[PDB]
DNA sequence: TTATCCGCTTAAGGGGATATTATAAGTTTTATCCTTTAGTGAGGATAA
DNA sequence: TTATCCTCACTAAAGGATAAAACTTATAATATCCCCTTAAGCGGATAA
């Protein structure tokens, strides 16, 4: 499937936006599906540096994926 | 490592590892030049922590975060 | 009943009790399972007697011992 | 908050004193030194009082600065 | 579809450093072990 | 009735020390705290 190492929010957001794109999902439907505003999703994607982890583990849900750490 | 689904557990994993390596909050708060009271609030109240500090902390422990299903 | 401060004063004391109550050392002994002789030493020579026995014959004269300041 | 019931066993009496000893902040060693006996003896008293001798009992009762009486 | 935008309530991060704790030591306070002698205390029992 | 002896298995207590456990400091380490400046995210929602 697809795993690479992410080391930064500007690197990590890239991949997530790619996932949503690929499954052809629109921001408007992830937001009205997890309970956050469309804006939230857009600000996240273009402004990853300062977003709350609740949002980040909340979007993974939307994208139907999870995460693990590794050395 | 197992799978992480919420900020809280995400902080336990990184905590659990910080202890295993016998590292202290102070010796790792200077390796990334960050506030000692930040690594603290992080482990206890990670829910609203910035993703920048998160990654500065992650690389502090010499590991790397990864997406999956 | 005044305060006692020696194994002797403590013995004369309890004996005077056994005496006034028509009891004998040979009978007091039966009821609490101790050698009649043992009671004879308790009164005549209490210094090396044993607290157990001490509270065996005590509870035998159906009495108790409370501390005092 | 300050009063004593009636002691019926050799343990009850033993622990009753171990309590007065501590409530006064006295170590088994200074009491022992006072009355010329070993601390090793004060020790076995609060622990294994069944076989202890009255001599010792009144020796500690005294140093602890107490006395006793008989009850009905 | 999505990057943008005023108002408005709630909070992390960089500063600077301290209440607050969980650990190492550091010793007190107790409990135990050795050897010997001596006296219970239980069996059984008998003077006076 | 009660004080005493005789044999025996058992241990207090005292002399001489010391393991093992309870409380006290050291002292590093994790959580808190005040103040500023700053961005988040929800609301209703609109330009591109």
User: How does DSSP assign A27-64, residue by residue?
Assistant: HHHHHHHHTS-HHHHHHHHH--TT-BHHHHHHHHHHHT
Tell whether B59 lies on the interface with A, counting CB pairs under 8 A.
yes
CA D53 – C1' F11 distance (Å)? 11
C22 in the Ramachandran plot: left (φ > 0), alpha (ψ -120 to 50) or beta? left
Q: What angle (nearest 5°) sits at the alpha carbon of residue D16, between those of residues C14 and D36?
A: 80
CA A25 – C1' E3 distance (Å)? 17
Phi first, then psi, for residue B68 (nearest 5°) are -175, -165
Q: How far apart are CA A57 and CA B27, in angstroms?
A: 28
Q: What six digits make up the tokens of B13?
A: 């994993």
Q: Which of B7, B66, B69 sits opposite A6 (nearest CB)?
A: B66
Per the CB < 8 A criterion, the answer to whether A17 and B69 are in contact is no
Using CA atoms in the order C29, C25, C35, C30, what is the torsion angle rounded to 10 degrees? -30
- Do C and B touch, 3+ Cβ pairs within 8 Å? The answer is no
Tell whether B66 lies on the interface with A, counting CB pairs under 8 A.
yes
B25, C19, D53, D64 from D2: Cα distances, Å? 50, 35, 28, 16
Q: How far apart are CA C5 and CA C2, in angstroms?
A: 10
A14, A61, D64 from A38: Cα distances, Å? 17, 15, 80
Tell whether D57 lies on the interface with C, counting CB pairs under 8 A.
yes
Q: How far apart are CA C8 and CA D49, in angstroms?
A: 19
Which helix H or strand E contains A68, and what residues bound it?
Answer: strand A66-68
Looking from the CA of A11 toward its CB, the CA atoms found within 13 Å total: 12
The residues, any chain, with a CB within 8 Å of residue A28's CB and separated by 6 or more, are A38
Which helix H or strand E contains B42, and what residues bound it?
Answer: helix B36-44
Q: Which of C57, C69, C29, B14 is nearest to A69 (CA)?
A: B14
The full set of domains in chain B, from first to last, is: 1-69 (1.10.260.40)
Q: How far apart are CA D24 and CA C6, in angstroms?
A: 23
Task: Match 């599906």 to its residue by tokens.
Answer: A33
Mutation to test the A interface, candidates B43, B67, B68, most A Cβ within 10 Å: B67
Nucleotide nearest to D50 (CA to C1'): F12
Nucleotides of E under 7 A from a protein CB: 1-5, 11-18, 28-33, 39-45
Resolution of the solved structure (Å): 3.2
CA A46 – C1' F13 distance (Å)? 86
Give buried/exposed letters for B17-34 (b at 16+ CB in 10 A, else e). bbeeeeeeeeebbeeeeb
**Strands B66-68 and C64-68, sheet pairing:** unpaired
A15 and B54: CB-CB below 8 Å?
Answer: no
């Amino acid at each position: 499937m697809s795993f690479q190492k992410i080391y930064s929010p500007t690197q990590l957001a890239n991949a997530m936006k790619l996932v949503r794109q690929q499954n052809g999902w629109t921001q408007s439907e992830l937001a009205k599906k997890i309970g956050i505003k469309q804006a939230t999703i857009s600000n996240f994607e273009n402004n990853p540096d300062n977003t709350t982890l609740t949002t980040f583990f909340k979007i993974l849900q939307s994208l139907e994926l999870s995460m693990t750490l590794c050395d």
